[PDB]
Every structure is written in C-alpha cells, then in structure tokens.
Structure 1
C-alpha cells in the first residue's frame, strides 16, 4: 500500500507519503481536497531521513536533499519535474527557460501547468520557477508558501566565514 506522516513546518503541516522509504507525495494538505489520503495508512515514524532533511532545510542547515523519490505523472510532466531538480538552492528559473531546457521552446505556459501538479513540493523545487513579470502564483495560500521558501533561500549566509578571515 502507501503510508503517510505529517510534520510541523514554518509553511504549515507538511504531509509526506509514499511506499517504504520512497517519497511519492509531499504537500501542505490542510484546507485542500485530497481524496487519495483516505486510503493511506498513518505511520508516525515513516520517512525519518526525509523529515530530518526538511527540518534541516527550514533551519538553514541544508541545501541539497538526499531522499529517494518516485515521481508519477505524464511524460511532459516528468520532463518538467526532472528539470526542476537541476535548479540549485537560492536560484530561480523562468518558465521559458525550463521549456527551453526540456526541448520545447515556447512551452512556458505548459511548464506552468505541469509545475502546478508537482507531487513533491520543496524537494522537487517548483517554487524556484517564476514568470518574467515577477508575480507568484498558486491558490490556497500557495503564493505565501512559495514566497516563504524563496525568502528563506535568499537569506542564506556565507558557509565559510573563515573566507573573510
């Protein structure tokens, strides 16, 4: 089957779901309709690796995840999500840049639609893609969550203070 675990976070309760140690879902699920969850098993100790990295991430002590994923969705979606995974912590891309990278120049709007279906938030960093006008998107408080994640990554202090001496 599929089990799940919900943890606290500065952007609200994050639900992690998947089989065994493999993540299939990561979403701030509250005040949204999510029918699959009814057929999920609660497991308060699942994905302990992932949960540690997420806590480390929010504390500014992590910038790269080592978490096994299983992304399910259409071919075009897989191409988009794979490309999201190449966007480093603290950087952003435009939808037009992602469309070029996946081999579909001009598909900025398709990238935006596919981006909104990302099953694994934060770790697959859909929040790092923004249109030219600079406007964040996402219903259900989604804009505010993205913005939080963005401000968090922009606040990154230099790693080695000894480089200043």
Structure 2
C-alpha cells in the first residue's frame, strides 16, 4: 500500500512516502542540495503523494503562492490516536502561516496547556512531515531560533527563506 519516491531540493534529496489514505512521511536524506527545480524520481502515485510533490515544489520555487496549495491528507500513527503531540502538530499546521513564527509557550497555550512548553518542544521531534507541518516556525520567545530535528543550519535556512533577517 505504501509507495515512495525521491525529490531533489535546496535542502538535499527528500524521500516521500504515502498511500491512498494519506501522506505518511517526509524525510531529509542529505544535509547535497541544488537550487534548480526538480521533478520527483517517479511521477504519479497515490493522490496524497502527488499533492505533496506539488506542495514542496511551490514551497521552494513559487513561495508567493504557497498558501494556495492544499496540504494532503495525512496517514501516520501519530495522527491516528489522541495525544498531546497530535494536538500540537495539528494546531501548528492549522494556525502558523508562511513567514510567521510562534514561541514554544504560545503553541503550548494554543494546545490547551500554557505550562507545557517543554512537551511542545519534545513533540516537534515526532513530526513525520517536516516543512509541511512547519515545526521550523516554532522558536524561542527570546528571539533565538531554537533547536531543530534537521539541525540548526536547516532551520535557519528555512526561516531565512521565509523572510526572517538571518
């Protein structure tokens, strides 16, 4: 049921996986890159996969129109059961737009528990679909960018790409 394909990007090769029920995971394989827009190794596939490739292409190469591309349905165990992690990931996906940032504290409050900023930071580690669900937009209230599953360099690259003065 699970299908996979790869896609070159400014952050290196990306491995995409999913099925008819939804996108399962977006994995960063090499942190090398390329600035020239590239197509997926294997075209077509489950609808969620095609929507993901279209979304990522727009994110990197036609950002001015990113809000116009639909986020595919997601199919991963983290989204199949109720948990604080799911609450946090879904709120992040729904609320934070391109170019905007939110603090660990603000996201915790949005998720119903203002004192759980540490757990929010921990929840970011469980995001199976980076970039798409913008965990890179969750930063420190001090102004510091904060930790990132893909490394500080990549988080800074993404934030700079979105207009921040970094």
Short-chain TM bin: 0.7 to 0.9
Runs of 4 or more consecutive aligned structure 1 residues displaced over 3 Å after TM superposition: none
Aligned residue number for residue 85 of structure 2: 77
Confirm whether residue 16 of structure 1 aligns to residue 16 of structure 2. yes
5+ residue gaps, structure 1, are 32-42, 156-165
5+ residue gaps, structure 2, are 32-40
Q: 1:126 to 1:87 in 2, by over 3 A?
A: same
CA positional deviation for 1:71: 4.3
Structure of higher RCO (CA pairs closer than 8 Å, 6+ residues apart): 1
Q: CA RMSD in A?
A: 2.1
Indicate the structure (1 or 2) with the bigger Cα radius of gyration: 1
- With the length of structure 2 as denominator, give the TM-score of the two structures: 0.77
CA positional deviation for 1:76: 0.9
Aligned residue number for residue 131 of structure 1: 140
Q: Partners of 1:81 and 1:27 in 2: how far apart?
A: 17
Confirm whether residue 95 of structure 1 aligns to residue 104 of structure 2. yes
Q: Secondary structure at the match of 2:56?
A: helix
- Map of 1:14-163 to 2, 5 A cutoff? 14-20=14-20, 22-30=22-30, 44-45=42-43, 46=45, 47-59=49-61, 60-64=63-67, 65-66=69-70, 67-73=72-78, 75-85=83-93, 86-133=95-142, 134-138=144-148, 142-154=151-163
